[PDB]
Structure 1
Amino acid sequence: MDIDPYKEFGATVELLSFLPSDFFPSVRDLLDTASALYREALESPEHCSPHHTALRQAILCWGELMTLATWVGVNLEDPASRDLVVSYVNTNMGLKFRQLLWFHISCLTFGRETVIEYLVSFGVWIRTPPAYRPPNAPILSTLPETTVVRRRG
């Protein structure tokens, strides 16, 4: 069974592979962002969108994993094995979770098509050799770098 988590969203694992593995934020930062913005929609009984469904299942899965980590911590007869297992989950499996969280959380705030155009643009930027690479890398945002606001009444 060759499922790609992104195929139904029109992305691919190769397109996100355009991003380097150290690009993605920490798990803590992504979970904090998700809790702050979409905790009330994610916990709702509505099929708000496929992004919410995916994000929900993934959070439950990461939870079952952290539970496994705590279980290994309390029920093992070896510190080395205990460390080896905890590291694999918080490192190898973590990178995968960080990538999915970023895509969905970014597709829900910025919008899917914005994320695909971002991925293409960043791919072009990072492929460029550093000698000719401009300093300002592409970034997802709504507002201009410097915002002009004045209020009157």
Structure 2
Amino acid sequence: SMDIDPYKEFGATVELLSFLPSDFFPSVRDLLDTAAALYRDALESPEHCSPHHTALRQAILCWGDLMTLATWVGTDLVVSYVNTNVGLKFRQLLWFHISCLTFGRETVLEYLVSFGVWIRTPPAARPPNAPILSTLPETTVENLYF
């Protein structure tokens, strides 16, 4: 069969995204609510807008199909299967496209590495708070970023 990595045309890979642990990601429900609040009109547009919009439109819809299936299930372990296992895959994909629309690919990728490194540092030995996803500087007390 075909080997398509959904991240590849966007300068990333499944493996890279797997560097982030599951509890880094917002829930599917909150990712969907965020795409709407930020991008509802672009997403509903007749224009492509960008490859990230095209790709995020299909993800949203696919999740819908998986949920429409769980909801049909339906009328427990199957429903759990969807929300647990399939859940993580969609959390990573929806987070990836929505964050790239917002902060751009370079920042997103830089952030995935920062957080992935921070979370793997023993808590007693690391800064108390996680690095901040942002395009804007924090600077020294030259602009500095996360």
Q: How would you bin the TM-score normalised by the shorter chain?
A: 0.7 to 0.9
2:52–2:101 contact (8 Å) kept in structure 1: yes
CA deviation string 1:106-129 (max 9, x = no partner):
000011111011112222222323
| CA spacing shift, 1:60–1:148, aligned 2, 3 Å | farther
TM-superposed deviation, 1:39 = 0.5
Cα separation, partners in 2 of 1:110 and 1:152, compared to 1, 3 Å: closer
CA 149–61 in structure 1, closer or farther in 2 if over 3 Å, else same: same
Equivalent residue number for residue 12 of structure 1: 13
* Higher Cα radius of gyration: 1
CA change 1:117–1:71 in 2 (3 A) is same
Is the alpha carbon distance of 1:34 and 1:147 closer, same or farther for their aligned partners in structure 2, counting shifts above 3 Å?
A: farther
With over 3 angstroms needed to count, the CA separation of the structure-2 counterparts of 1:112 and 1:146, relative to structure 1, is closer
- Residues 132 and 150 from structure 1, CA distance in 2 versus in 1: closer, same or farther, beyond 3 angstroms? closer
TM-aligned CA distance change 1:45 to 1:149, over 3 Å:
farther
Tell me the TM-score normalised to structure 1 length.
Answer: 0.82
Name the structure 2 match of 1:57. 58
**How many pairs align?**
144
Sort the Cα spacing of 1:110 and 1:87 in 2 relative to 1 into closer, same or farther, 3 A.
Answer: same
How far has the Cα of 1:36 moved from its partner? 0.5
Q: Which runs of 5+ in 2 are unaligned?
A: none
- Pair 1:84-2:85 in alignment: no
Q: Provide structure 1 residue ranges, at least 5 long, that are not aligned to the other structure.
A: 74-82
Q: Cα distance, 1:146 vs. partner?
A: 12
Instruction: Pick closer, same or farther for the CA change 1:150–1:68 going to 2, 3 Å.
Output: closer
CA distance in 1, matches of 2:37, 2:145: 31
Higher mean displacement: 63-72 or 105-114: 63-72
Q: Taking every aligned residue pair, what percent have the same amino acid on both sides?
A: 92
